[PDB]
Amino acid sequence: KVFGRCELAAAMKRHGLDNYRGYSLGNWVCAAKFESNFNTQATNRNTDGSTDYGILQINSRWWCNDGRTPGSRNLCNIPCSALLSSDITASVNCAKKIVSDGNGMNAWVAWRNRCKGTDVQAWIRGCRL
Ligand SMILES: [Cl-]
Ligand SMILES: [Cl-]
Ligand SMILES: [Cl-]
Ligand code: NA
């Protein structure tokens, strides 16, 4: 599923991401835009052999099991394929564990390089929330 901007904002707010660990909703929408272009089915392979999955590009070396990343830790206790669903619940629940890990949203390289320090409220402007 490819979300619309406001549709994704509303879904993330319903799943408790707005101001989660102090990160306003615009931060999460911005991260999803540049990680996946709002596409729940996005996958990308990393140089170390791990793969990133879903709307927030969660990595198989630490967070989910894809059966082909040796020595991976599966900290969200899910198959990585569950992160590609049109239902974003699994991605949101795992993202909450990632952002609580000590480094905040800096875990998402696209957020650090393209969202951090910008006017992220622009990403929810006009939305009925
Ligand atoms: Cl915001
Ligand atoms: Cl990740
Ligand atoms: Cl933080
Ligand atoms: Na893993």
UniProtKB/Swiss-Prot annotation:
The protein's Enzyme Commission number: 3.2.1.17
Catalytic activity: Hydrolysis of (1->4)-beta-linkages between N-acetylmuramic acid and N-acetyl-D-glucosamine residues in a peptidoglycan and between N-acetyl-D-glucosamine residues in chitodextrins
Main localisation: secreted
Annotated C-type lysozyme domain residues: 1-129
Localisation: Secreted
Annotated disulfide bonds: 6-127, 30-115, 64-80, 76-94
UniProt tissue specificity: In the egg white and polymorphonuclear leukocytes.
Catalytic residues in the record: 35, 52
Pfam family, one: Lys
Keyword Magnesium: no
Highest taxon in the source lineage: Eukaryota
Molecular function as annotated in GO: beta-N-acetylglucosaminidase activity; identical protein binding; lysozyme activity
BP GO terms, sorted: cell wall macromolecule catabolic process; defense response to bacterium; defense response to Gram-negative bacterium; defense response to Gram-positive bacterium; killing of cells of another organism
SMART domains tied to this protein: LYZ1
Residues the record lists as binding substrate: 101
This protein's UniProt keywords: Allergen, Antimicrobial, Bacteriolytic enzyme, Disulfide bond, Glycosidase, Hydrolase, Secreted, Signal
GO CC terms in record: cytoplasm; endoplasmic reticulum; extracellular space
Keyword Cytoplasm: no
InterPro entries from the UniProt entry: Glyco_hydro_22 (IPR001916), Glyco_hydro_22_CS (IPR019799), Glyco_hydro_22_lys (IPR000974), Lysozyme-like_dom_sf (IPR023346)
Function of the protein: Lysozymes have primarily a bacteriolytic function; those in tissues and body fluids are associated with the monocyte-macrophage system and enhance the activity of immunoagents. Has bacteriolytic activity against M.luteus.
Note: Lysozyme C is capable of both hydrolysis and transglycosylation; it also shows a slight esterase activity. It acts rapidly on both peptide-substituted and unsubstituted peptidoglycan, and slowly on chitin oligosaccharides.
Complex and partners: Monomer.
Family: Belongs to the glycosyl hydrolase 22 family.
UniProt-recorded name of the protein: Lysozyme C
Taxonomic source organism: Gallus gallus (Chicken)
